[PDB]
Amino acid sequence: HAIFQRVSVNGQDQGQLKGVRAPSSNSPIQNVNDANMACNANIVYHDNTIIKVPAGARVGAWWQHVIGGPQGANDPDNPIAASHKGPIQVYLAKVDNAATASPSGLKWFKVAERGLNNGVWAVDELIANNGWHYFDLPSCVAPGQYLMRVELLALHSASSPGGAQFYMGCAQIEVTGSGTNSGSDFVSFPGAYSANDPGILLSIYDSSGKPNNGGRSYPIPGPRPISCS
Ligand SMILES: [Cu+2]
Predict the structure, then answer these.
(1) How far is the CA of 27 from the centre of ligand 1 (A)?
(2) What spacing in Å lies between the alpha carbon of 142 and ligand 1's midpoint?
(3) What are the BP-aspect GO terms (predicted)?
(4) Chain centre to alpha carbon of residue 129
(5) How far apart are the C-alpha atoms of 226 and 111, rounded to whole Å?
(6) Burial letters 168-199, b for 16+ CB under 10 A, else e
(7) Ligand 1 centroid vs 1 CA: distance in angstroms?
(8) Distance between CA atoms of 85 and 124, rounded to whole angstroms?
């Protein structure tokens, strides 16, 4: 359990909860067809900040166990429980106004993904970076208003149908710059994922119980991220 609550753009912190729609109370989604798979349920924090992100920028998304982080407490499950290994991905959906747009029934395209690399998951990197997930918004992304959905998929129980846990939230962004590419390989949320996808229904464990996926590659679910080639 963890909540996306803050964005950085090229190392500039945009402010706690600025432009990030967040619940205060996050259970995971475990049904890939849940209506709230886009931007999560029971949003409490929703301001009218629209974050300017240059195409090409390095974007940080901050996650903490609870809203505001531990504020000095020793939380072993901050930024997220270490057991919760999995990928982190980012999608965009174009909207007319990112402050006011509803998340339902949009067309999403993938702009970044990170999975498993030499036994290290994206979630491990998140933990190493104190809750920050970094990715590069590709330089070709067309300017305009978008919701930016950051999704963490925890696979510690994913060997059982329905056992995968999806954590997500949406930031309100305006992409600026010189890009012209609006996406190619679009999905619905819900609708992107099957519960039998091999990156959703799998054992990530070797025989000793190490969550290193046993030397197997991890097939990240969803469409391919856009390429600027
Ligand atoms: Cu959890």
Answers:
(1) 7
(2) 35
(3) cellulose catabolic process
(4) 15
(5) 6
(6) bbbbbbbbebebebbbeeebebbebbeeebeb
(7) 3
(8) 7
Q: Give resolution, Å, one decimal.
A: 2.3
What spacing in Å lies between the alpha carbon of 80 and ligand 1's midpoint? 7
Residue 42 per-residue DSSP state:
S
Q: How far apart are CA 49 and CA 51, in angstroms?
A: 6
Q: Where are the domains of the chain?
A: 3-215
* Structure obtained using: X-ray
CATH architecture of 3-215: Distorted Sandwich (2.70)
Q: Which two tokens stand for residue 216?
A: 């197997």
Distance separating alpha carbons of residues 202 and 100, to the nearest angstrom: 38
Ligand 1 centre and the CA of 169: distance in Å? 15
